[PDB]
Each structure stands twice: as C-alpha cells, then as structure tokens.
Design a binder for this molecule. Structure first.
Ligand code: YTX
Length: 167
C-alpha cells in the first residue's frame, strides 16, 4: 500500500490522475518524481520549469553543477538528482522533443529509465510542449514501464481524452 490518492487504474502497474505534478509531489513526497527534462537540464518551462520553480531554483543550481561535471544527457537518457522539497529523488528523463525534430522512436528508451525505480510519480513523457501525440505516449508508457507509475496529467481536457481513448 502507498500514499497516492484518486488515481484511476489503467493497468496492473500504471495509474493516472488529472493533477499538477508539483502539487502531487508536495502532498505525497514520493521516493521519485520524474522531470520531463532536456539534455542540458535547463528547466525553463512546463513540468521542468514548474518543478524547478517549486524548489526555489535549487533544482537548476544542482543541474548546472551536474552538467558542468558530466556534460549533457542523451535523448532517451536520464540522471538521478535530488528531489529537494518535492521528493527524495528526481529522475530527470529526456523524452524526444518533436518541436526540436527528435526521433519519436526514442520515447520507448526514455520510458525504460522508469524500470530502475519501484514506484514513480511522473509527467506523460513527450506530451504537452514536447510535441508528441499524448495518446501514443500513454501507450508506450503502459507497454514499456513494468514498475509502478503514477501519471500526473496537468491539462484537464487532455486527461479526459486520454482516459476515454485508452485501450
Ligand atoms: C512532458 O512534459 C509536459 C507534459 C505536459 C502535458 C500535461 O501534463 O498536461 C505538459 C507540459 C509538459 O512540460
């Protein structure tokens, strides 16, 4: 048994809710919150900008030191950094950004990172401002992630569409 509330069960291991991931993280303090990162860990907008703002920019300060030491992530890759005030850990995962012209086939690789963590609170990768089809992202999530994932979808109309269309 865990602390996540009001999620709709989609599969054995995937659950979904219409919620602000920042507000969910603040309430649950999960072991792992997933950030929808870019390869430079520049947390400017969307879930990344919203998570970073909720940490008072501490996420960005930590990320800048990570990049200075290790260089950029790969598209499809990830790193584990602090969750600051939101979670124990933040798993920064880079899904492909269609609006930068990145290969959508890398979405499955991005979701595979979730399998290294038993439970996660996460964004629907490559959806929203990342430019991919969110129905497709949810399908790739359910077909790739085997650990327990609690998906927080910010946009209400997007949530209703994802639930109604889920196979
Ligand atoms: C995958 O990252 C994002 C996903 C979404 C979709 C949503 O939850 O409404 C919005 C903004 C984002 O930055």
């Amino acid at each position: 048994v865990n602390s996540f509330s009001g999620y709709l069960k989609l599969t054995d291991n995937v659950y979904i809710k219409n919620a602000d991931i920042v507000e969910e993280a603040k309430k649950v303090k999960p072991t792992v919150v997933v950030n929808a990162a870019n390869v430079y860990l520049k947390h400017g907008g969307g879930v990344a900008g919203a998570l970073n703002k909720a940490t008072n920019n501490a996420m960005q300060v930590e990320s800048d030191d990570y990049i200075a030491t290790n260089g950029p992530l790969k598209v499809g890759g990830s790193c584990v950094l602090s969750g600051h005030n939101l979670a124990k850990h933040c798993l920064h995962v880079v899904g492909p950004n269609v609006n930068k012209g990145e290969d959508i086939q890398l979405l499955k690789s991005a979701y595979e990172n979730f399998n290294q963590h038993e439970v996660l609170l996460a964004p629907l990768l490559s959806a929203g401002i990342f430019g991919a089809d969110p129905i497709h992202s949810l399908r790739v999530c359910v077909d790739t992630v085997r650990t327990n994932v609690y998906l927080a979808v910010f946009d209400k109309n997007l949530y209703d569409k994802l639930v109604s269309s889920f196979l």
